[PDB]
Amino acid sequence: MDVILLQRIKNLGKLGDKVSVKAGYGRNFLIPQGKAVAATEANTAAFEARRAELEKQEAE
RNA sequence: GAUGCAGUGUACCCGCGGCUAGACGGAAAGACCCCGUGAACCUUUACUGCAGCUUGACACUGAACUUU
């Protein structure tokens, strides 16, 4: 899947970068636990337009 | 393989008790044998399928460190 990260991941990236992962990785680990969101156009717009400042605010 | 054909012999008409030599006696469209481009079930290194079992590829299926 194409996903947008919600946090730091060692080999993927961090804090809003769009990166393609294997479908099982996104479906079973990241998305259910909130570490990323599927990179739909609506999801990307909703993430970047508003919420991103607080997402950056949480350092740890 | 004749009561019924030919020739011939014998023989008045009709029961009853017995008998089983013949009526190729009765019974069952021969089961033995052969035939039909018939049937069924069984067998196998007959033919052709399938179930079952098994092999690999793709999908469900992800992450981080090493080696040739």
Separation of A11 CA and B67 C1' (Å) = 22
Q: Distance (Å, rounded) from C-alpha A30 to C-alpha A28?
A: 7
What does the block give as tokens for A43?
């999801």
Q: Give every CB contact of residue A11 below 8 A, 6+ residues apart in sequence.
A: none
- Quick one: resolution in A? 2.2
Cβ atoms of A9 and A18 closer than 8 Å: no
Nucleotides of strand B lying closer than 7 angstroms to a protein CB: 60-65
The structural domain count of chain A equals: 1
The experimental method is cryo-EM
The backbone torsions φ and ψ at residue A54, rounded to the nearest 5 degrees and listed phi first, read: -65, -40
Footprint of strand B on the protein (CB under 7 A): A 10-11, 21-25, 27-29
DSSP helix/strand/coil, A1: coil
Neighbours of A36 (CB within 10 A): 25
For residue A11, the enclosing domain spans 1-60
What does the block give as tokens for A19?
């990166």
Nearest nt (C1') from A28 Cα: B62
Q: Distance (Å, rounded) from C-alpha A43 to C-alpha A55?
A: 14
Q: Nearest CA to A44 among A13, A19, A25, A12?
A: A19
The backbone torsions φ and ψ at residue A45, rounded to the nearest 5 degrees and listed phi first, read: -65, -45
